Amino acid sequence: QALLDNQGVSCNLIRSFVGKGVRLWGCRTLLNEENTAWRYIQIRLLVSSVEHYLSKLARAYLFEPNTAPTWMKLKGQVWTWLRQQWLAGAFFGTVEDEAFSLSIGLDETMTEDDIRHGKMILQVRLALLAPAEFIAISLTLDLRD
Amino acid sequence: APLSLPPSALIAGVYGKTDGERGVWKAPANVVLNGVSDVSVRVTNEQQAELNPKGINVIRHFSDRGLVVWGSRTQKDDDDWRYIPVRRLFDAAERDIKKALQPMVFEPNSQLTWKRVQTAIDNYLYRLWQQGALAGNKAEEAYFVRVGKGITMTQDEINQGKMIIQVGMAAVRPAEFIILKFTQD
Amino acid sequence: LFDAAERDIKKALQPMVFEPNSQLTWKRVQTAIDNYLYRLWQQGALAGNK
Amino acid sequence: VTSVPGVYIEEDASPAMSVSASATAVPLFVARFTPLKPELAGVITRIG
Amino acid sequence: TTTYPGVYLSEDAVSSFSVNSAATAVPLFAYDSENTNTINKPIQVFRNWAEFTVEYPTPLEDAFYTSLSLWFMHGGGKCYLVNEANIADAVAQYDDITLIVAAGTDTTTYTAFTTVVGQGYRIFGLFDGPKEKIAGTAKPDEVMEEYPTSPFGAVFYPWGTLASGAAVPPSAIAAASITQTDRTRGVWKAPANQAVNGVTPAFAVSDDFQGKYNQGKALNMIRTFSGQGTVVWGARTLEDSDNWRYIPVRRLFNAVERDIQKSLNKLVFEPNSQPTWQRVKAAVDSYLHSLWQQGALAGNTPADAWFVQVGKDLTMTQEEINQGKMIIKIGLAAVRPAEFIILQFSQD
Amino acid sequence: TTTYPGVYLSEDAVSSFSVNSAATAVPLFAYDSENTNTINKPIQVFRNWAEFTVEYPTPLEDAFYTSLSLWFMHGGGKCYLVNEANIADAVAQYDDITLIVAAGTDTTTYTAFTTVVGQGYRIFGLFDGPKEKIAGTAKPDEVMEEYPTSPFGAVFYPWGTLASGAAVPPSAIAAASITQTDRTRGVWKAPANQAVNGVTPAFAVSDDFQGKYNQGKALNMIRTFSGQGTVVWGARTLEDSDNWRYIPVRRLFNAVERDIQKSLNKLVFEPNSQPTWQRVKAAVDSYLHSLWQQGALAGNTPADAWFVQVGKDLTMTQEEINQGKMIIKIGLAAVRPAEFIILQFSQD
Asked: Which ranges carry the Tail sheath protein C-terminal domain (chain B) (predicted)?
């Protein structure tokens, strides 16, 4: 009955069930916290592989020129790729527009200073799913005469 | 036996995280010290009231989140600079424009040089304004950089070659002492 | 009628008997007396017209 | 009044008042009686 | 910085917030430190019936034993039990305590109660009625001044004597009504018609001795009826004030802010900027609006049923921004309990 | 200087300034020099209830032990405790004293009170009353010449008795009413109708014995009503002049200057020129405008409520500028309590 004090950081409990096997019973990171989307360990790790996937193609576009058409070349790619992935149900939202959003542009990410610093900058948006952890049942008899 | 340590070493590293994601203009208080057992002497709230004037800061201990730094006030207490970020915002904005005016330090003092300098300073505070670091409203009133000859100068200090850059900002203050004051209506 | 209308307002001004004599106290008292005679008017006890 | 930064809580207090009516009834009678207990000799007593 | 050529990366920095709701009933129980048939550890930190029974398999008849029996008969929660000497201490520690019972302990209790409200820690205590049988012929107020006035408390006279066992202070008994109130529905609902089980009042009180003590202060006797049996009865704080009568509307604001004041502790040392200010406003109103659409607070067009205001000069002007201070303010429409019922006929 | 070529930079010389609010309540108490069950240290500093218990483990019966236990129980804060021979030293050092109360000392206390008034330290004491039972047959004046006539202080007669323990001197009862007043709603409101808890007066005074002691001097009885109980009653200082009555209008002027005098210590030796005169004038009225919206000082068109003026020939002409003097004058009209409420009926 100790560690039930939620003043120190969270755990992952493991429980042996009766009519089914020993079921895993914890996924909520040691950010012992209610609002940051950095509990729910799969959320931490889903982004990181996409980070790995976008770094996978970032080094391809390495010594580019700073032109707006050259931005558009990447802009088709990610819009292509994550669309599938949101349509693979990996992401939130019933439209793609609320799924992921891109914001590279002239002073939307960059400026001429970063053009003459050769920076190549993009803003990456994503809305978030959630697992359905708990069962808040309410009943209503509804007399019916 | 555990050895004591003056905290001026590990408090330098916590300034390296705040300028990473949040920037310079955020006071480091809610940042959590990463890896320590306990403070040497336990301070309480009734002598926090005495030590928060004559401004010196304090390492606090909390039950739920552990040790945390607390207070972001500098030494001398006029309303000019009482806060760490308002001091460190003017200290970093000067060092970036002073390093790039050093290539142009012997150019002639005509009028086309004046409008080229006044613009490159204008496009530096505007980028810094629209990322939430100058406490101005939706007007322009955060900078008044002027370099003219009728304004801000006159003829006789041109002969002892000078330039005058009157520039001024309006920094943002940290929000402490949040007061609710509920009412009935 | 005058004997009962005085005894109800005198009993409730007794909690506010040492408050400052500024202007925001004046409009709060003048209203709580206004909403007492208006309720008593519209139930047929003050002989005034419409 | 405020030294430790923290967060402070505060409410607005006011004696804001309204008036409600009582009843004009329930007198007292000062006739002679015969009480049963000696503490009922000379003190006001509520009868329901 | 961007030193070597290559791929650098940034992310989102800071997010929104909302409050985390409540506990609404963490009672410490008034352990008597002089008492011996018990753990002379003053503070008992108790979770449910099980560790209680491994503590007390021993059927006592002292009121705290009858309390946690009754308390955990209604479910009950992680409820504590500190002596009459260590009230303020764990309150300064445990930051959850919502309720303060009277286990027949008054003298140092009321002082320690009025001590901490002298620093105002946002709790609702509640007291015992006097022991037995006011004659009611006279003496109408001289049974009350023994209890400190506050917007925080009531006494609940009849000493629900719990005919199974020993005479139980109705501090313990009315808490069971609350225990099946928050479990039923929240705090703004008045625990005034929850009926308790197997507890008998010592006295079947009155309607008029009831009615003549409905005013002045917060007697709030607990009367058995037909249908509803041994039910709680009457809801009113100690002052009969237009701001504070009706204990849930007091307890509403007792609960309305300890979530909020807690929640925003993470949010200090922050750049006191205009886009901060609007954003802070943006989180509360919806949580209010939910709570309004919960019907916890009264009032249509709910920005009428509250208001909210924070800015640069309507609140928190220049130099105290320069002093670091921010001030905000709200005010709101709440419900009031329909305590009284009259009804009018006409033949038209 | 401009010795070598390169890039120089200067910054601003002077910045803005403003005043910080207040503390409003730091009392020092009246120890007794001949007392035995105590420490021989003259000056003690107590900050809250915690160290007071570890210093004094046993409950005593002396007048100072019953006084601090009544201060902390109604909230309270940082309070001192000095012997009755060293008030004239302790006030001149600690720079935050507001109240000089008397915990059952009269003879040698009245001399040390009027001492620190003689240097003009801007302090406000408060005294005890006579011991027991003015018979009321006669003699309205002969109980009132043993009290030093000054616009600082009151007497607070009826000697509350603290039904838990022994008697309490009424300076502690009056000092507890100020603590829950300035924390609740300002200092301009009188410690007048806020109730205290746990203290009953030993006597029942009258309705009319208040009447003959309301003129001349300011007995300010402590009287218990129905409903609200054991409340203080009457806020009047020792003189009857139309400038200095009404204890809250004294403490308003007493605390509106101890924050200006504290702030202007960093503005001396500044050049007595034109940009100084338009900066102090623009910094004082920005503090009064924050004080006018809060209801402290009454008046519409807030140019009518106060005035501030500073110049070259309206005040401080040319010859006394050459001596260095910088004289100003500000004047403001505060609020006064509505001690008497008369109401007129008519027919129209």
From this structure: 77-182
